[PDB]
Design an enzyme around this catalytic site. Structure first.
Site, PDB file in Angstrom:
ATOM      1  N   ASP A  35      44.766  45.329  41.249  1.00  0.00           N
ATOM      2  CA  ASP A  35      43.425  44.777  41.420  1.00  0.00           C
ATOM      3  C   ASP A  35      42.572  45.776  42.190  1.00  0.00           C
ATOM      4  OD1 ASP A  35      41.223  43.272  41.770  1.00  0.00           O
ATOM      5  OD2 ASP A  35      42.103  41.849  43.184  1.00  0.00           O
ATOM      6  N   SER A 199      25.754  52.086  36.700  1.00  0.00           N
ATOM      7  CA  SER A 199      25.638  52.399  35.285  1.00  0.00           C
ATOM      8  C   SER A 199      24.192  52.762  34.965  1.00  0.00           C
ATOM      9  CB  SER A 199      26.080  51.190  34.452  1.00  0.00           C
ATOM     10  OG  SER A 199      25.826  51.382  33.076  1.00  0.00           O
TER      11      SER A 199
HETATM   12  C1  LIG Z   1      45.117  36.455  38.700  1.00  0.00           C
HETATM   13  C2  LIG Z   1      44.055  36.327  39.759  1.00  0.00           C
HETATM   14  C3  LIG Z   1      43.442  37.462  40.280  1.00  0.00           C
HETATM   15  C4  LIG Z   1      42.439  37.390  41.241  1.00  0.00           C
HETATM   16  C5  LIG Z   1      41.770  38.629  41.776  1.00  0.00           C
HETATM   17  N1  LIG Z   1      40.523  38.956  41.087  1.00  0.00           N
HETATM   18  C6  LIG Z   1      39.567  37.845  41.048  1.00  0.00           C
HETATM   19  C7  LIG Z   1      38.212  38.382  40.606  1.00  0.00           C
HETATM   20  S1  LIG Z   1      36.963  37.116  40.608  1.00  0.00           S
HETATM   21  C8  LIG Z   1      35.519  37.915  40.017  1.00  0.00           C
HETATM   22  O1  LIG Z   1      37.350  36.103  39.669  1.00  0.00           O
HETATM   23  O2  LIG Z   1      36.744  36.705  41.965  1.00  0.00           O
HETATM   24  C9  LIG Z   1      42.046  36.143  41.694  1.00  0.00           C
HETATM   25  C10 LIG Z   1      42.630  34.994  41.201  1.00  0.00           C
HETATM   26  C11 LIG Z   1      43.619  35.102  40.248  1.00  0.00           C
HETATM   27 BR1  LIG Z   1      44.375  33.496  39.588  1.00  0.00          BR
END
Ligand SMILES: Cc1cc(CNCCS(C)(=O)=O)ccc1Br
Length: 330
Positions: A35, A199
């Site tokens: 991530d 971008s």
């Molecule tokens: C799989 C997972 C990953 C993450 C990490 N990224 C989240 C990005 S956002 C834009 O949705 O806040 C959060 C929850 C789960 Br469930």
């Protein structure tokens, strides 16, 4: 040193990608979501509330001869979707694709939210944003990349995510066979702890390129492409029957539609997202309404170049003293 690991979609929609990570001695292999939008390496563990574990592989620090409790340290992370997890912290040996870090902070979950429990395929997260976002208290901890950086041949990692197929995360080198043409580099701001860049514009399908600055983050942990409402409306206006549905939570479109591509600018270069990458399938099983892969960022507070965008490119996360991002077609 270098490392190279295959990353694999968790499902037929590329909702997320998992990469095997070796933790402890003997190794315990967990499949983590890498991530670039967060900075904690946390895992399901033998300490996770039992009712909140449903099929995940767990890290058991008591079975690792190299694990050490980081005394007094706790962590707690709230994500953009309202998901959360929290717990305590061990240091242990962590290896990715042959690259080993000793003394890595491994954040052991005592509690996780429903979105993680319901996802039996994701055993935790490996954060790759800047260590200033790490949530460990009272002593903030470094990411895997920050700990590895000095040992790497070059202080970089690359994301090469596949469309409906596996891809690759490399650490310490740029695989010049993995992309076409040249890599265009662009400036990064670390002021919010993200791989934040600007971008240079966009095009919809075969339409003319609109030159306009779009600040956003390169986030491998977000599935979709979240952009300003003006841009997103211009895209979906080219799909007959597409509309924003408040009840579903974003733009939907008839599953019978053929979607146009979407191009984003990186300096003078252009990355083309094929229309098929923007199809996230029926909103519910059997429905003829399909969920769009380009959605408005208006309710987020930041634009997010998530997997829909990143999987169309070979992406270089350059962690030199002044960080930069690189994008190439592939
Ligand atoms: C799989 C997972 C990953 C993450 C990490 N990224 C989240 C990005 S956002 C834009 O949705 O806040 C959060 C929850 C789960 Br469930």
């Amino acid at each position: 040193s270098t490392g190279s690991a295959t990353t694999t979609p968790i499902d037929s929609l590329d909702d997320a990608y998992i990469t095997p990570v070796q933790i402890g001695t003997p190794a315990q292999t967990l499949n983590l979501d890498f991530d670039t939008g967060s900075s904690d390496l946390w895992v399901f563990s033998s300490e996770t509330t039992a009712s909140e574990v449903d099929g995940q592989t767990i890290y058991t620090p008591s079975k690792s001869t190299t694990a050490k409790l980081l005394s007094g340290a706790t962590w707690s992370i709230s994500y953009g979707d309202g998901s959360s997890s929290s717990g305590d912290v061990y240091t242990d040996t962590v290896s990715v694709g042959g690259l080993t870090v000793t003394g890595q902070a491994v954040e052991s979950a005592k509690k996780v939210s429903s979105s993680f429990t319901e996802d039996s395929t994701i055993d935790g997260l490996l954060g790759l944003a800047f260590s200033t976002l790490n949530t460990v208290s009272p002593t903030q901890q470094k990411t895997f990349f920050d700990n590895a950086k000095a040992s790497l041949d070059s202080p970089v990692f690359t994301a090469d995510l596949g469309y409906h197929a596996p891809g690759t995360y490399n650490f310490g080198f740029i695989d010049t066979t993995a992309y076409t043409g040249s890599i265009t580099y662009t400036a990064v701001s670390t002021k919010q702890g993200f791989w934040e860049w600007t971008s240079t514009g966009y095009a919809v399908g075969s339409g003319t390129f609109k030159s306009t600055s779009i600040d956003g983050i390169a986030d491998t942990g977000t599935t979709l492409l979240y952009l300003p409402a003006t841009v997103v409306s211009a895209y979906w206006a080219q799909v007959s029957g597409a509309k924003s549905s408040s009840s579903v939570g974003g733009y939907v479109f008839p599953c019978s539609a053929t979607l146009p591509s979407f191009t984003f600018g990186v300096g003078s270069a252009r990355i083309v997202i094929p229309g098929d990458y923007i199809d996230f399938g029926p909103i519910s099983t059997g429905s003829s309404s399909c969920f769009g892969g380009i959605q408005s960022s208006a309710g987020i507070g930041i634009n997010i170049f998530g997997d829909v965008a990143l999987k169309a490119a070979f992406v270089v996360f350059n962690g030199a003293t002044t960080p930069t991002l690189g994008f190439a077609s592939k």
